[PDB]
Design a protein around this ligand. Structure first.
Ligand code: D9H
Ligand code: ZN
Length: 257
């Protein structure tokens, strides 16, 4: 099965998922000087006030904080998007060291981690149908750098002990994802893909320019998770990121000058 090791990592994925070498793969390097300001891009609308978190799951690749997406309770609209996209889950990708971990890079700079808030286009009815569409998903990407703690992340950090291994889940209600956002919603946007198998080309990427700061202690707790299941040899869940893929025939647009 695919993963992030030497023998099943990103350079191997194309064998089971040929779209890995496709025309709109993610992540990518964001070359800030080549991105073009698009004055027609609208401000992002992040409406998370009625978000209902339910559960947190270690899926063997990352951990997902899952939301009730059976109504318009937490939605992303505006920006480059047409219509309404519902929040279904967020997760992170992170490194074994603070100098790596993000999937997108900015002028080749790697951040310590990257948060993905995953949303699906309500015109397609559910996530499974949405991922089959070129405009099916909108993923809001937020970089993490190590410095001051992010207070709104701490409730996530403190439950990780209870989902150490693959397949473990825990109740995770009343978590407010607004506490994970930076001050500014300035963003870059481009058409891309899921960054893990099945690597489907269904995502409008919206990557915020402003990173959030998390503490060394907070990211160290991410690195104590396991890729393996309980009772299997311990393999730390670190470096669960795909590297930058070729931009090919795409332009990255900026919402800001
Ligand atoms: N890293 S990412 O591109 O944001 C991303 C987002 C979602 C998924 N996949 C996903 N996301 C959800 Cl909410 N459900 C399922 N069901 C399939 C489970 O195998 N798969 C993969 C990568
Ligand atoms: Zn992701």
């Amino acid at each position: 099965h695919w993963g992030y090791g030497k023998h099943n990592g990103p350079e191997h994925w194309h064998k089971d998922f040929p779209i890995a070498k496709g025309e709109r793969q993610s992540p990518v390097d964001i070359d800030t000087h080549t991105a073009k300001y698009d004055p027609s891009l609208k401000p992002l609308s992040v409406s998370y006030d009625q978000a209902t978190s339910l559960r947190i799951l270690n899926n063997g690749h990352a951990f997902n904080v899952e939301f009730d997406d059976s109504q318009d309770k937490a939605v992303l609209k505006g920006g480059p998007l047409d219509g309404t996209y519902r929040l279904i889950q967020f997760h992170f990708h992170w490194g074994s060291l603070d100098g790596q971990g993000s999937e997108h890079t900015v002028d080749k700079k790697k951040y310590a981690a990257e948060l993905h808030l995953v949303h699906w286009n309500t015109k397609y009815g559910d996530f499974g149908k949405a991922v089959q569409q070129p405009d099916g998903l909108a993923v809001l990407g937020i970089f993490l750098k190590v410095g001051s703690a992010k207070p709104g992340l701490q409730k996530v950090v403190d439950v990780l002990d209870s989902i150490k291994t693959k397949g473990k889940s825990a109740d995770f209600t009343n978590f407010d994802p607004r506490g994970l956002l930076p001050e500014s919603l300035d963003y870059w946007t481009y058409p891309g893909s899921l960054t893990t198998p099945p690597l489907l080309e269904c995502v409008t990427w919206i990557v915020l320019k402003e990173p959030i700061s998390v503490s060394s202690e907070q990211v160290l707790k991410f690195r104590k998770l396991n890729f393996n299941g309980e009772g299997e040899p311990e393999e730390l869940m670190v470096d669960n990121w795909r590297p930058a893929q070729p931009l090919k025939n795409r332009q990255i647009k900026a919402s800001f000058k």
